Amino acid sequence: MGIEYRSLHTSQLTLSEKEALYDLLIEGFEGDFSHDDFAHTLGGMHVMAFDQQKLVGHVAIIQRHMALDNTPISVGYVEAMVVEQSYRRQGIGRQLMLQTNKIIASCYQLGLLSASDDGQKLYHSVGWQIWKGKLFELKQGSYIRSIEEEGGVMGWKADGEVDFTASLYCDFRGGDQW
Amino acid sequence: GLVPRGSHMGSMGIEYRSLHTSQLTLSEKEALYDLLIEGFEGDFSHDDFAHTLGGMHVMAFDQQKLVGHVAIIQRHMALDNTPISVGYVEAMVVEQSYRRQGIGRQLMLQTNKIIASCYQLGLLSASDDGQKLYHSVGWQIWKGKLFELKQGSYIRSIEEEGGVMGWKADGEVDFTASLYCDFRGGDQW
Numbered sequence: 217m218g219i220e221y222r223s224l225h226t227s228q229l230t231l232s233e234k235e236a237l238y239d240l241l242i243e244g245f246e247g248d249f250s251h252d253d254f255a256h257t258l259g260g261m262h263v264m265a266f267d268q269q270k271l272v273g274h275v276a277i278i279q280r281h282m283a284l285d286n287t288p289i290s291v292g293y294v295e296a297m298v299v300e301q302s303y304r305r306q307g308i309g310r311q312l313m314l315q316t317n318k319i320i321a322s323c324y325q326l327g328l329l330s331a332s333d334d335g336q337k338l339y340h341s342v343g344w345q346i347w348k349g350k351l352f353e354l355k356q357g358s359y360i361r362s363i364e365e366e367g368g369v370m371g372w373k374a375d376g377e378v379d380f381t382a383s384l385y386c387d388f389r390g391g392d393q394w
Numbered sequence: 395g396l397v398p399r400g401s402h403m404g405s406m407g408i409e410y411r412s413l414h415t416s417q418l419t420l421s422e423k424e425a426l427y428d429l430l431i432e433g434f435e436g437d438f439s440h441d442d443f444a445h446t447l448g449g450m451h452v453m454a455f456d457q458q459k460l461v462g463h464v465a466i467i468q469r470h471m472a473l474d475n476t477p478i479s480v481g482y483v484e485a486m487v488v489e490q491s492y493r494r495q496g497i498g499r500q501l502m503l504q505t506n507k508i509i510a511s512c513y514q515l516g517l518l519s520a521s522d523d524g525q526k527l528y529h530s531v532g533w534q535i536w537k538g539k540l541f542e543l544k545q546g547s548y549i550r551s552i553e554e555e556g557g558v559m560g561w562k563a564d565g566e567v568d569f570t571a572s573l574y575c576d577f578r579g580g581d582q583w
């Protein structure tokens with residue numbers, strides 16, 4: 217412990233934090249990180265962990281506009297969790313998601329994310345549970361169903377009640393829509 | 395208790411603060427809502443207040459009084475069939491007694507800064523009485539066709555064409571291409 221946490225919007229980042237963020241994401245994902253993945257990281261809030269001026273952890277929360285069963289839903293979508301390897305064994309990830317949960321709770325109706333191989337445990341340990349409904353994405357104007365993502369997407373409710381069996385229609389982006 | 399949030403500058407006795415929605419108190423949320431209705435003379439709907447939150451706010455205060463606001467929403471659209479990241483400008487308003495003092499200009503200058511650092515294109519929907527201010531800081535009429543998701547299908551937004559304005563974020567965007575916005579409650583533009 218001894219890690220200072222900062223919640224800042226992309227518009228508030230230093231050049232130092234951006235350059236440190238980019239190096240951390242590449243080390244953590246090492247070629248699994250597209251230029252599209254980097255694009256999805258930007259535009260919203262970043263939760264960052266610092267060990268005495270040098271960045272050790274990061275998670276981002278971006279606003280997405282989806283449809284939950286023909287009803288508009290304001291989603292805080294979680295992107296690019298990464299913790300430096302030497303710092304992965306200190307609960308930094310859990311602290312990251314708890315600030316994430318607060319931001320989602322004070323801004324959006326629903327938090328969404330697409331779990332990775334390393335972690336479907338950490339997200340579950342702070343209240344995230346697998347999304348059970350069908351998932352759809354925009355593909356050249358019309359909506360295709362994202363079968364390859366169902367079971368990999370998890371949600372988190374904040375002060376409401378959302379049918380985790382309903383269909384979700386995500387907004388359009390580059391690369392992986394989820 | 396209360397700590398410094400985001401960022402602050404001052405211009406001619408007016409303090410301007412850029413805050414994310416997650417960085418505002420419930421009291422500040424209600425002060426803003428009070429500002430929006432009085433400033434729009436009742437035209438401001440609850441769907442429009444929902445469209446205001448979730449992103450950044452620039453807020454102008456005459457001393458302790460909230461006298462100006464603008465919001466920058468992140469929206470995910472398509473240009474033709476290319477993905478484009480949009481900072482959508484919402485709920486621009488200055489209190490009636492505080493017009494003619496350069497507050498809307500300063501609000502938009504901060505808006506341009508936020509957009510330039512975060513998104514590829516700024517977009518807004520302006521009134522015919524409001525196009526003059528955004529033109530004064532580089533915004534141009536969008537020339538392409540506009541589309542909106544209605545019940546899962548894209549329909550042409552004929553009534554909004556000519557009323558949407560854009561501001562390129564240090565790049566190149568063809569303002570004659572068509573725009574396919576994201577789904578939301580209330581008015582899509």
Ligand SMILES: CN[C@@H]1[C@@H](O)[C@@H](O[C@@H]2[C@@H](O)[C@H](O[C@H]3O[C@H](CN)CC[C@H]3NC(C)=O)[C@@H](N)C[C@H]2N)OC[C@]1(C)O
Pocket residue numbers: 245248249250253294295296297298329330331332333364365368392394
């Ligand atoms: C079906 N089995 C899965 C397999 O489809 C795949 O899932 C991918 C998921 O990981 C990825 O998002 C994660 O990777 C992005 C770029 N690499 C950065 C954000 C990161 N999540 C954030 C919260 O850290 C999604 N954008 C796309 C998913 N297809 O890889 C994991 C998997 C379990 O094998």
Ligand SMILES: CN[C@@H]1[C@@H](O)[C@@H](O[C@@H]2[C@@H](O)[C@H](O[C@H]3O[C@H](CN)CC[C@H]3NC(C)=O)[C@@H](N)C[C@H]2N)OC[C@]1(C)O
Pocket residue numbers: 437438439442483484485486487518519520521522523553554557581583
């Ligand atoms: C085609 N002639 C226009 C006419 O369609 C209409 O345009 C509307 C536009 O104004 C409105 O957005 C403005 O009002 C929102 C809620 N009222 C708050 C945000 C505010 N823009 C923010 C930046 O101040 C859009 N959301 C919907 C548009 N239909 O009214 C104006 C008009 C000139 O008559």
